[PDB]
Design an enzyme around this catalytic site. Structure first.
Site, PDB file in Angstrom:
ATOM      1  N   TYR A   6      14.917  42.522 -27.981  1.00  0.00           N
ATOM      2  CA  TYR A   6      14.990  41.303 -27.221  1.00  0.00           C
ATOM      3  C   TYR A   6      17.134  41.940 -25.825  1.00  0.00           C
ATOM      4  O   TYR A   6      17.050  40.979 -25.411  1.00  0.00           O
ATOM      5  CB  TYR A   6      15.745  39.706 -27.994  1.00  0.00           C
ATOM      6  CG  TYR A   6      14.433  39.763 -28.772  1.00  0.00           C
ATOM      7  CD1 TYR A   6      13.219  39.815 -28.634  1.00  0.00           C
ATOM      8  CD2 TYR A   6      14.619  39.300 -29.540  1.00  0.00           C
ATOM      9  CE1 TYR A   6      12.227  38.941 -29.305  1.00  0.00           C
ATOM     10  CE2 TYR A   6      14.038  38.019 -30.145  1.00  0.00           C
ATOM     11  CZ  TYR A   6      12.079  37.899 -29.618  1.00  0.00           C
ATOM     12  OH  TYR A   6      11.343  37.372 -30.770  1.00  0.00           O
ATOM     13  N   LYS A  23      13.488  42.433 -36.327  1.00  0.00           N
ATOM     14  CA  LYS A  23      11.922  42.691 -36.653  1.00  0.00           C
ATOM     15  C   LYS A  23      11.375  44.081 -36.079  1.00  0.00           C
ATOM     16  O   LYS A  23      12.724  44.651 -35.330  1.00  0.00           O
ATOM     17  CB  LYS A  23      11.235  41.754 -34.941  1.00  0.00           C
ATOM     18  CG  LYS A  23      11.269  40.296 -35.325  1.00  0.00           C
ATOM     19  CD  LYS A  23      10.364  39.599 -35.388  1.00  0.00           C
ATOM     20  CE  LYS A  23      10.760  38.475 -34.892  1.00  0.00           C
ATOM     21  NZ  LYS A  23      12.184  37.863 -33.617  1.00  0.00           N
ATOM     22  N   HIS A  79       7.175  43.733 -36.587  1.00  0.00           N
ATOM     23  CA  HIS A  79       6.813  42.180 -34.835  1.00  0.00           C
ATOM     24  C   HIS A  79       5.704  42.564 -34.708  1.00  0.00           C
ATOM     25  O   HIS A  79       5.034  41.268 -34.508  1.00  0.00           O
ATOM     26  CB  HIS A  79       8.374  42.958 -33.895  1.00  0.00           C
ATOM     27  CG  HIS A  79       8.410  42.148 -33.228  1.00  0.00           C
ATOM     28  ND1 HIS A  79       8.034  41.454 -32.830  1.00  0.00           N
ATOM     29  CD2 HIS A  79       9.884  42.227 -32.232  1.00  0.00           C
ATOM     30  CE1 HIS A  79       8.167  40.252 -31.592  1.00  0.00           C
ATOM     31  NE2 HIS A  79       9.728  41.606 -31.009  1.00  0.00           N
ATOM     32  N   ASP A 119      16.938  33.510 -35.244  1.00  0.00           N
ATOM     33  CA  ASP A 119      15.967  34.671 -34.817  1.00  0.00           C
ATOM     34  C   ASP A 119      15.803  35.977 -33.859  1.00  0.00           C
ATOM     35  O   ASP A 119      16.707  35.246 -32.675  1.00  0.00           O
ATOM     36  CB  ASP A 119      14.695  34.434 -34.960  1.00  0.00           C
ATOM     37  CG  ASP A 119      13.749  35.020 -35.121  1.00  0.00           C
ATOM     38  OD1 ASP A 119      13.075  35.843 -36.320  1.00  0.00           O
ATOM     39  OD2 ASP A 119      13.236  35.503 -33.627  1.00  0.00           O
TER      40      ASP A 119
END
Ligand SMILES: NC(=O)c1ccc[n+]([C@@H]2O[C@H](COP(=O)([O-])OP(=O)(O)OC[C@H]3O[C@@H](n4cnc5c(N)ncnc54)[C@H](OP(=O)(O)O)[C@@H]3O)[C@@H](O)[C@H]2O)c1
Ligand SMILES: O=P(O)(O)OC[C@H]1O[C@@H](O)[C@H](O)[C@@H](O)[C@@H]1O
Length: 315
Positions: free
Chosen positions: A48, A77, A110, A43
């Site tokens: 990030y 996402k 997201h 994932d």
């Protein structure tokens, strides 16, 4: 049971490795270890700030022939600053670049909330509030659908959508591709029975994030609930001779959910995989469900006034 069937015909590994908070300097090793250990589902997200480094691991294991690309299931996402129809393809392409792949298995919206496009992930005004976009969910969905038609992604889904927001897409005039997956927060303290029953009735697979309660969330406090150290959950684990983490990972799996625990620690990535070989009794499951206290790790609190904020509805 190791994989669930999505509505596009593909098969999604029920266990995956999460990468939020995984530092750039550690996550390449983390992903190499996971794939070696037998993880096949990672994932990811642009937000990030570590997709390049995840991509280094995926490339090394493909080159080594530990896995074929078709065996991997890579998720990313679309961040909130790219909800505009015209920005979506570009956001997807940049993620493909960083990850060094030519398609994603699953691409999620997201959050349902669109923000002002720019370099800032959370664009603020002079009053320090988050500046929304006027974009809506259906337009962003239309943009995601043509990613499928272009061959950039195999399936599309959503994340942190409430049931009315899922409903909205399902009732979209000329809907071409249904959401394959709604990825939501879920653990013993936030059991999400209504929403999970809703999505599963509509043929949408649910992925449980923060299954261990996200003890490393940057906003953590000392008085805060801890799942890993709940004595009641420690007791259920002791009974099975498993760790409380392995119990917290097995729990969503027996609810026919996909679950994506994060670790950058090689011992724990290994420990977290050994969850296919035991069974929680129905008494254990009912007991774990009874621990619900509607407690959220990720409440996106800076966006509580956004027109599309997902957590005012009951579910
Ligand atoms: N869609 C969304 O909006 C959203 C939001 C939140 C999360 N997610 C996804 O879900 C993934 C998991 O959620 P999360 O990162 O919040 O947290 P989580 O998996 O619930 O917890 C991760 C924490 O648990 C620790 N840990 C892992 N295994 C452990 C074990 N065996 N024993 C003891 N501690 C253990 C990790 O430490 P070490 O890493 O140091 O081992 C890390 O500090 C995320 O990384 C992300 O991929 C998505
Ligand atoms: O990062 P996720 O939990 O997947 O969701 C997206 C965002 O929400 C929260 O976690 C914080 O406001 C940030 O750390 C992040 O930019």
């Amino acid at each position: 049971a190791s994989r669930l069937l999505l509505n596009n015909g593909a098969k999604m590994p029920i266990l995956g490795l999460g990468t939020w908070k995984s530092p750039p300097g550690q996550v390449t090793e983390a992903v190499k270890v996971a794939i070696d250990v037998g993880y096949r589902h990672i994932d990811c997200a642009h937000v990030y700030q570590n997709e390049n480094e995840v991509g280094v691991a995926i490339q090394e294991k493909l080159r080594e022939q530990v896995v074929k690309r078709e065996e991997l299931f890579i998720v990313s996402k679309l961040w909130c600053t790219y909800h505009e129809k015209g920005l979506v393809k570009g956001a997807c392409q940049k993620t493909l670049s960083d990850l060094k792949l030519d398609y994603l298995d699953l691409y999620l919206i997201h959050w349902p909330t669109g923000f002002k496009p720019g370099k800032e992930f959370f664009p603020l005004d002079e009053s320090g509030n988050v500046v929304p976009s006027d974009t809506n969910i259906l337009d962003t969905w239309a943009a995601m659908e043509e990613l499928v038609d272009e061959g950039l992604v195999k399936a599309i889904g959503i994340s942190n959508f409430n049931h009315l927001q899922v409903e909205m897409i399902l009732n979209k005039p000329g809907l071409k591709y249904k959401p394959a997956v709604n990825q939501i927060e879920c653990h013993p303290y936030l059991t999400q029975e209504k929403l999970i029953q809703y999505c599963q009735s509509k043929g949408i697979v649910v992925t449980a994030y923060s299954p261990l309660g996200s003890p490393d969330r940057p906003w953590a406090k000392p008085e805060d609930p801890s799942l890993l150290e709940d004595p009641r959950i420690k007791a259920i684990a002791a009974k099975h001779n498993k760790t409380t983490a392995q119990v917290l990972i097995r729990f969503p799996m027996q609810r026919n959910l996909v679950v994506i625990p994060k670790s950058v620690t090689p011992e724990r990535i290994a420990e977290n995989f050994k969850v296919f070989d035991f069974e929680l009794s129905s008494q254990d499951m009912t007991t774990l469900l009874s621990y619900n206290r509607n407690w959220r790790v990720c409440a996106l609190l800076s966006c509580t006034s956004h027109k599309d904020y997902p957590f005012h509805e009951e579910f």
